[PDB]
Design an enzyme around this catalytic site. Structure first.
Site, PDB file in Angstrom:
ATOM      1  CG  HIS A  46      -1.637   1.196   1.367  1.00  0.00           C
ATOM      2  ND1 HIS A  46      -2.804   1.483   0.785  1.00  0.00           N
ATOM      3  CD2 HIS A  46      -1.285   2.549   1.967  1.00  0.00           C
ATOM      4  CE1 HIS A  46      -3.464   2.774   1.189  1.00  0.00           C
ATOM      5  NE2 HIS A  46      -2.382   3.328   1.884  1.00  0.00           N
ATOM      6  CG  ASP A  97      -0.626  -3.356   3.034  1.00  0.00           C
ATOM      7  OD1 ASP A  97       0.077  -2.946   1.921  1.00  0.00           O
ATOM      8  OD2 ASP A  97      -1.208  -2.774   3.726  1.00  0.00           O
ATOM      9  N   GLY A 196       1.117   6.961   8.291  1.00  0.00           N
ATOM     10  CA  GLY A 196       2.789   7.045   8.629  1.00  0.00           C
ATOM     11  C   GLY A 196       3.657   5.948   9.171  1.00  0.00           C
ATOM     12  CB  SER A 198       1.053   1.671   6.917  1.00  0.00           C
ATOM     13  OG  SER A 198       0.015   1.738   7.928  1.00  0.00           O
TER      14      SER A 198
HETATM   15  C1  GBS Z   1      -0.738   2.885   8.069  1.00  0.00           C
HETATM   16  O1  GBS Z   1      -0.313   4.048   7.578  1.00  0.00           O
HETATM   17  C2  GBS Z   1      -1.912   2.650   9.156  1.00  0.00           C
HETATM   18  C3  GBS Z   1      -2.265   1.632   9.432  1.00  0.00           C
HETATM   19  C4  GBS Z   1      -3.118   1.336  10.591  1.00  0.00           C
HETATM   20  C5  GBS Z   1      -3.761   2.739  10.767  1.00  0.00           C
HETATM   21  N1  GBS Z   1      -4.888   2.496  11.653  1.00  0.00           N
HETATM   22  C6  GBS Z   1      -4.895   1.996  12.824  1.00  0.00           C
HETATM   23  N2  GBS Z   1      -3.825   1.320  13.493  1.00  0.00           N
HETATM   24  N3  GBS Z   1      -6.243   1.976  13.410  1.00  0.00           N
HETATM   25  C7  GBS Z   1      -3.509   3.794  10.352  1.00  0.00           C
HETATM   26  C8  GBS Z   1      -2.567   3.737   9.427  1.00  0.00           C
END
Ligand code: GBS
Length: 245
Positions: A46, A97, A196, A198
């Site tokens: 992603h 992902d 950020g 992820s």
């Molecule tokens: C990645 O950029 C990402 C992963 C997961 C979330 N949300 C939560 N952990 N609830 C936002 C962004």
């Protein structure tokens, strides 16, 4: 990272900071990753899907700060950007992902281990900790859902693994979550991954070894009640990682 604490790279030395060069030369932070061997960083598809050209990306190892150099850091070009050909995304859930970056310095070298640069072990196939296990997440993502800025200093927090069953419930994610995903959250919903974070690591101790159980992938908002963070279940992708490395 919502809540949690500030850290330095010494406490997550496999952590990779991945940035993109814009047409016009400006460089913005994209996503985290994890060093799984000297030449390989593992991250989330992603992160790259909108800008799939390997030449647009810069990977740092040994880096604790977003927009300042850390002493000892190493800077890499991406020699191979491998996205998961079965990747799919709906309004929320991200499927398969997972992404591999083969890294190469301008001198044609891979990572050299140091106090601030180390690899993380992959899990044994389908070998995950039991639900309720405390794991750590690391990244440069937002400290609040409403923030515009990313923190300058690296952060970490602790989240607990949630069962497939609990995560499948109505008011959680329903069928959005699959057996190739892991949910994790705080009992008070007070700390989480956010925008950020992820691509970055979810690390668990498995039979006393620090293990890349997860890759920060998706969630509804950040640190929302009944909306856990969702992670790529690394232990279910070993054949894909094996065949691409
Ligand atoms: C990645 O950029 C990402 C992963 C997961 C979330 N949300 C939560 N952990 N609830 C936002 C962004």
């Amino acid at each position: 990272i919502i809540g949690g604490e500030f850290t330095t790279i010494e406490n997550q030395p496999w952590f990779a900071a991945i940035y993109r060069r814009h047409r016009g030369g400006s460089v913005t932070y994209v996503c985290g990753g994890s060093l799984i061997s000297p030449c390989w960083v593992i991250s989330a598809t992603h992160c790259f899907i909108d800008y799939p050209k390997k030449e647009d990306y810069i990977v740092y190892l040994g880096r604790s700060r977003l927009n300042s150099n850390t002493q000892g850091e190493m800077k890499f070009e991406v020699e191979n950007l491998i996205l998961h050909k079965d990747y799919s995304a709906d309004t929320l859930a991200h499927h398969n992902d997972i992404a591999l970056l083969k890294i190469r310095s301008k001198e044609g070298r891979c990572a050299q281990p140091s106090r601030t640069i180390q690899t993380i072990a992959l899990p044994s196939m389908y070998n995950d900790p039991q639900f309720g296990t405390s794991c750590e997440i690391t990244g440069f993502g937002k400290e609040q859902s409403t923030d515009y800025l990313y923190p300058e200093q690296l952060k970490m927090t602790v989240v607990k693994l949630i069962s497939h069953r609990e995560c499948q419930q109505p008011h959680y994610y329903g069928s959005e979550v699959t057996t190739k995903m892991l949910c994790a959250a705080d009992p008070q919903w007070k700390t989480d991954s956010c925008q950020g974070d992820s691509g970055g690591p979810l690390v668990c101790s498995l039979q006393g070894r620090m293990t890349l159980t997860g890759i920060v992938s998706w969630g509804r908002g950040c640190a929302l009640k009944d909306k856990p963070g969702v992670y790529t279940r690394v232990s279910h992708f070993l054949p894909w990682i094996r065949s691409h490395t």
